[PDB]
């Protein structure tokens, strides 16, 4: 289809680098024809679930906005990029609403994201006083206070730094290998639709 | 590092934050138990008859342990 204004899914999925999950990255998609054929034609998708819409129907639907959130987590953790999950990631890193509408796409990125003797570039949040509300982002690096004793900006007993690095050796079992995740969230307000499939 | 010496009370070589100072009690054959933490706090279900005291280098109430920072934690002798 020869279109003039086409949504940048290419830019989202084919980015060279991806955010740490704690500091997940969001791109807004608006006022463009969304061709999801470029997702269908991927061989490489390990996970491709949609919530509230059939993946086979995306090219038929209009939305007010689409939001492309992206990040890197463990293979073991993709499970948590779903409505109503718990775990370090879902709880403290990236939470979806219980009534989420969108797709979660993930692929093994061992090839790009692991370095021999570890790639310590990728971080996730290990401690937080509460859980995240849906689509909340926490990038603060305040030393986590466990005890009733203040931490005074330094580390120690009951005073731990809230971010941990993933290992990411090339030799890790699939479960511990890095996966790149894209979360398309379809947003439907009482406004004109700006993002429509070609159908 | 901090060198702890009990008498014949617990003294420290360098100054020690009160928040990271604890008293322990050991009976023959058993593991230690926590009595006092944070210099002057009672552990849960520890009798009223016990009390903790001190700051700086001088601490008064068996073992005293300091746990300040990431490293350099030491115990007294007895």
């Amino acid at each position, epitope marked *: 289809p020869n279109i003039t204004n086409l949504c940048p899914f290419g830019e989202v999925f084919n980015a060279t680098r991806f955010a740490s999950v704690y500091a997940w990255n969001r791109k807004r998609i608006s006022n463009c024809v969304a061709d999801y054929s470029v997702l269908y034609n991927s061989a490489s998708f390990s996970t491709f679930k949609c919530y509230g819409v059939s993946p086979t129907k995306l090219n038929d639907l209009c939305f007010t906005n689409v939001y492309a959130d992206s990040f890197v987590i463990r293979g073991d953790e993709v499970r948590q990029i779903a409505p109503g999950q718990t775990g370090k990631i879902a709880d403290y890193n990236y939470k979806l609403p219980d009534d989420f509408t969108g797709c979660v796409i993930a692929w093994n990125s061992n090839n790009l994201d692991s370095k021999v003797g570890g790639n310590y570039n990728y971080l996730y949040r290990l401690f937080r006083k509460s859980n995240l509300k849906p689509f909340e982002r926490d990038i603060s690096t305040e030393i986590y206070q466990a005890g009733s004793t203040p931490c005074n900006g330094v580390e120690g007993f009951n005073c731990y730094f809230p971010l941990q690095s993933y290992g990411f050796q090339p030799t890790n079992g699939v479960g511990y290998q890095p996966y790149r995740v894209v979360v398309l969230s379809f947003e439907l307000l009482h406004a004109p639709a700006t993002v429509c499939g070609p159908k | *590092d901090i060198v702890l010496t009990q008498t014949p009370s617990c003294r420290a070589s360098q100054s020690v934050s009160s928040s990271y100072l604890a008293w322990y009690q050991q009976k023959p054959g058993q*593991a230690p*138990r926590l009595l006092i933490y944070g210099a002057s706090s009672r*552990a849960t279900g520890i009798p009223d008859r016990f009390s903790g005291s001190g700051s700086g280098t001088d601490f008064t109430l068996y*073992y005293c342990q300091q746990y300040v920072g990431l490293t350099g934690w030491t115990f007294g002798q*007895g």
Partner: nanobody
Amino acid sequence: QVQLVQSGPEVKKPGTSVRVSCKASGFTFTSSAVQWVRQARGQRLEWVGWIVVGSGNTNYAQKFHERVTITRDMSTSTAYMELSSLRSEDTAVYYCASPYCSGGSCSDGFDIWGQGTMVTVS
């Protein structure tokens, strides 16, 4: 019930390595930490090191700084202490200890101790 359970007594020979375990149940082990304390026969306490359960961050004392390894296993609620290059000085009773943690916050001291492990090198 809330406790820490160590493995039984160990007997090794000079030079070799030993692998002590410390199992936790009851309290939320993840938000906790585990220190390791050794004690010779009728003598003072000495510090070996400590780990943070969530992170695996280890610090050691001078005497062991390159011949001891404290690891943990969250998915089994078990911490380990590993001493290598054993000698006469390493024939002691080894304890693991933890602060009580209950989800959000923790108590401000090591209020949970094991039953102990006598290690023998002869």
